Design a protein around this ligand. Structure first.
Ligand SMILES: O=C(O)CNC(=O)C(=O)O
Ligand code: NI
Ligand SMILES: [Zn+2]
Lengths: 344, 4
C-alpha cells in the first residue's frame, strides 16, 4: 500500500514550511501525514523565519504559576516512577532564579549525548520543580497562524456541542521547565494529537514510539509494573512512568529521539507515546487537537479506570457527524473497525 | 470533561 511505503522506518520527520504553506494549519497537518510523518508518533515543524507569536517575552516575570510541582523520581536501571509534589504558587521571576541557581542549573556538557547520559544518571537526585499545566497563552491576540489558543480543528466540536472546556485539552497550557524536569511516557488524552511550541529558553528533548509499536511499549510497561497494570487498565495515563532509551533498546521497542529548540513546534500524533526532559529554563505552550483520522482512535482509546477526574470526551457527536453509517453499529457495540496506523 |  502507498501509505506503508512512506516513512517505512517510522522515523521522526522535520518540516520547514514557507509562510504560504504554514498559514493553513489543518491543511499542513494533512500534508505532513501525506509524507508519513504520523508514523513516527512525533514530528517537528520549524516555522518560517519571519513568523513570531509574540513581540517580546520581557513582560511575563509577574505571571503566576499557581501549582508548581517538585518531581520526585524513584527507581533504577532505566525504570522510574515520578511522584509530583505540589508546591506553593510562584511567579516566573521566582521560578527563573531557582531554575538558574547553582543548585538546579544545567550541568556543563559537550554534545546532547553527554547531557542525555547526565539526565538518566541523575534524575532521581535533586528533585527539580516544573511549572507545568499553567492555564494561558503567550501568543499575541492578532496571530492567525498556528495559534495554539484557536487552531480551529474539529476538536472544537466538543465545546460547540456541549459548552465543555477541558483545561490543556481544548484550552492552552504553559510549561516553564528547568534542568531535568520531565514528562513521562504517555499518549494524549483520548489518543488525540498535541501541538507544543517552545517560546523560549533551553531545549526540550523528546522520545517517541511509533503508534504501530505502541502496544509493544504497553506490554513492556505492564510487565515492569504489574501492580499498576492490575489496578488500572491504562496506568500510563497517570503520567508517572519513565523508561530510558537503553531499556527500550534492551527490549526491542522501536523509538526515535529529537531535540526541540526555542521557536520550533512539535506535533504528536494519535497513539504516539512520547516522553522527554527539559535542558534548562524554558517555556512551552501546548494543547490538543483532532482531525477526522483521530476519530477511530478516540472511539477505541483505553482510558484510566481508577481515577474519577481523568479526561473522557463523548465520541457520539463525532461518530454522528463523520461516520453516520457506523453510528447505529457502534451504538449496538458491534463496530469491529481495525485501525491502520500508516493510513492518512 | 476532565482536566489534562
Ligand atoms: O512539555 C511537557 O512537559 C510535555 N508536553 C507534552 O507531553 C505534549 O505537548 O504532548
Ligand atoms: Ni504529550
Ligand atoms: Zn488509572
Amino acid at each position: 500500500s502507498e501509505s506503508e511505503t512512506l516513512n517505512p522506518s517510522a522515523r521522526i520527520m522535520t518540516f520547514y514550511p514557507t509562510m504560504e504553506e504554514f498559514r493553513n494549519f489543518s491543511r499542513y497537518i494533512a500534508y505532513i501525514e501525506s509524507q508519513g510523518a504520523h508514523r513516527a508518533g512525533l514530528a517537528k515543524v520549524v516555522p518560517p523565519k519571519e513568523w513570531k507569536p509574540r513581540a517580546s517575552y520581557d513582560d511575563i516575570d509577574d505571571l503566576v504559576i499557581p501549582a508548581p510541582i517538585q518531581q520526585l523520581v524513584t527507581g533504577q536501571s532505566g525504570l522510574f516512577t515520578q511522584y509530583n509534589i505540589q508546591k506553593k504558587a510562584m511567579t516566573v521571576r521566582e521560578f527563573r532564579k531557582i531554575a538558574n541557581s547553582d543548585k538546579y542549573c544545567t550541568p556543563r556538557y559537550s554534545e546532547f549525548e553527554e547531557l542525555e547520559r547526565k539526565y538518566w544518571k541523575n534524575l532521581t537526585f535533586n528533585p527539580p520543580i516544573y511549572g507545568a499545566d499553567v492555564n494561558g497563552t503567550l501568543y499575541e491576540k492578532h496571530v492567525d497562524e498556528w495559534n495554539i489558543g484557536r487552531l480551529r480543528t474539529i476538536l472544537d466540536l466538543v465545546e460547540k456541542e456541549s459548552g465543555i472546556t477541558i483545561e490543556g485539552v481544548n484550552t492552552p497550557y504553559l510549561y516553564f521547565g528547568m534542568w531535568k524536569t520531565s514528562f513521562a511516557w504517555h499518549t494524549e488524552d483520548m489518543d488525540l494529537y498535541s501541538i507544543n511550541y517552545l517560546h523560549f529558553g533551553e531545549p526540550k528533548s523528546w522520545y517517541s514510539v511509533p503508534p504501530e509499536h505502541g502496544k509493544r511499549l504497553e506490554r513492556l510497561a505492564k510487565g515492569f509494573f504489574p501492580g499498576s497494570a492490575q489496578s488500572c487498565e491504562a496506568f500510563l495515563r497517570h503520567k508517572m512512568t519513565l523508561i530510558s532509551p537503553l531499556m527500550l533498546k534492551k527490549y526491542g521497542i522501536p523509538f526515535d529521539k529529537v531535540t526541540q529548540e526555542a521557536g520550533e513546534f512539535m506535533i504528536t500524533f494519535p497513539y504516539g507515546y512520547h516522553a522527554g526532559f527539559n535542558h534548562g529554563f524554558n517555556c512551552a505552550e501546548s494543547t490538543n487537537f483532532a482531525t477526522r483520522r483521530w476519530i477511530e482512535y478516540g472511539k477505541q482509546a483505553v482510558l484510566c479506570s481508577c481515577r474519577k477526574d481523568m479526561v473522557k470526551i463523548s465520541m457520539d457527536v463525532f461518530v454522528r457527524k463523520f461516520q453516520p453509517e457506523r453510528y447505529k453499529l457502534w451504538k449496538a457495540g458491534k463496530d469491529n473497525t481495525v485501525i491502520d496506523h500508516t493510513l492518512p | 470533561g476532565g482536566v489534562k
